[PDB]
Amino acid sequence: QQPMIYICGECHTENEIKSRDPIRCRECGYRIMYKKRTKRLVVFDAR
Amino acid sequence: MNAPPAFESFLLFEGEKKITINKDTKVPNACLFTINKEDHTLGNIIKSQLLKDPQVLFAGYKVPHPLEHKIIIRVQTTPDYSPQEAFTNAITDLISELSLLEERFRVAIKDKQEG
Amino acid sequence: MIIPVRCFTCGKIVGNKWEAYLGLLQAEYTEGDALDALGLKRYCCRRMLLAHVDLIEKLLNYAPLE
Amino acid sequence: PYANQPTVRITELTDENVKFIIENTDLAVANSIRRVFIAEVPIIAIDWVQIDANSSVLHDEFIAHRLGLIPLTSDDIVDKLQYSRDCTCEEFCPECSVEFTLDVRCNEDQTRHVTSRDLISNSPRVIPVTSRQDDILIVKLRKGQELRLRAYAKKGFGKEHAKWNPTAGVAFEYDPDNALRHTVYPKPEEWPKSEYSELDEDESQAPYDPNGKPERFYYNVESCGSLRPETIVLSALSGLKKKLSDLQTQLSHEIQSD
Amino acid sequence: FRKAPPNYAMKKTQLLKEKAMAEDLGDQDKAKQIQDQLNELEERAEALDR
Amino acid sequence: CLLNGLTDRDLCELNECPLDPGGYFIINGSEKVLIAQEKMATNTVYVFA
Ligand SMILES: [Zn+2]
Ligand SMILES: [Zn+2]
Ligand SMILES: [Zn+2]
Incomplete structure (x- = not known):
């Protein structure tokens, strides 16, 4: 049950965007938004 | 992308021998010792120790190639003193010397602290 | 962009000396004196504090939120 | 046809560096001990x-890189732990590693300075250098940013990577007067006298010496703060002794097999 | 209901206010826009100093 | 332009840096710059051989 949460461009507010939907912030309304970091096991070696 | 890992310089790989003896044919009583996963650290001191020994006619090491982790030590003794025992004696005395140096250094420190 | 953690050539920890170096420069000291006041003898480790540029400030100006 | 009886004399012992002298030993031994100081010294x-x-604002790998370079006091823990590669268990066991956690989040308006003091170690003795002088600056966070992670530490030596390099800089120097001529000065008068020079201010360099061997090696090992300097020397001596012992065992087995 | 200045639209809001003031030929509207712009600039300066 | 005589504060808030020299167009989201061409000065008499 993952609605593919996004991060607004300037508001820096989360949004719930699903397929076949416009790409806009829930408030104000902007056309830019980035994704959120994965949940995978991001493991680096301090080398 | 092809950079080798850092552990290949000292850690042995499965099947590789740490030390290999190979008798030479050009002159009597001459062997080449081949050491895997080592550097100048463990070859230079042995070279010097072999030089100290008078019965050793020739002694010298080399690094075939810097990117390769391998060294070759050539030893040639008098006919009545096989190079194997020369190597063993060199290492044994070198270990004794380092142990003595450690003991002296430790006593010197413990005396230096409030003394 | 940020003070390194160790001197490239020497290896002496220098990361923990940027704030101190700035404070010493600010109060009254001059660079040539502040550097040896911090204890940086070798000239190899001094280039860390003299040449280092502090861009992390400009980076922090672009606050993501608020 | 045997070894020699070297002598040692410390001139300056502090908690930050050690200056000593070794006499009656060969150059090869001196330089080898140096290279062991820099390269083969266990450390966390x-x-x-x-x-x-x-x-x-920094990369993901930037944090890990920097955290790789923060020294950790290992006065009595390095000797006890075992190399992760040779551990006989899965995951970083505490018996063979030391775990670290960092969780900082800039809430107030003033910019944070995430310093090494935020590295909350599980073990008491294995901590960055802050016991007794600011702390190593990691990264700067601004209101709204955060940095959550945990890292494990393991025993290594400088040869594998620089992070395991306890010594800041080894000052090795022998025969301060150029008595053995190992270097030829085009204009000896132009050069400044070495710190260890016994030669007066009139003469430039000692007269040549044919039957002269290098002795009196001057050391200035300088600990980065992870280990105490004398501890670095003792560990290096022990490590070299162990390497020779292993080599001797391998050679013995090789000869016996033949 | 959500007030405008919050949080990253300070510069965009200032530009919008300046544009509206320039477009509006009225004196009272011009004065109100100038006052609002000055207040926004002062608040931004205070936040930066903090 | 929208950054005519604007303070570094607003530039930083607009995800721009005050150091950017500017003077370059943005077409299709690419920075295009016009190279200054050169030619012979007009309305001047030259006598070549
Ligand atoms: Zn929107
Ligand atoms: Zn340096
Ligand atoms: Zn384990």
């Missing part, structure tokens, strides 16, 4: 960083 250091949430 961060080697496995798992980043969970990093909203700082």
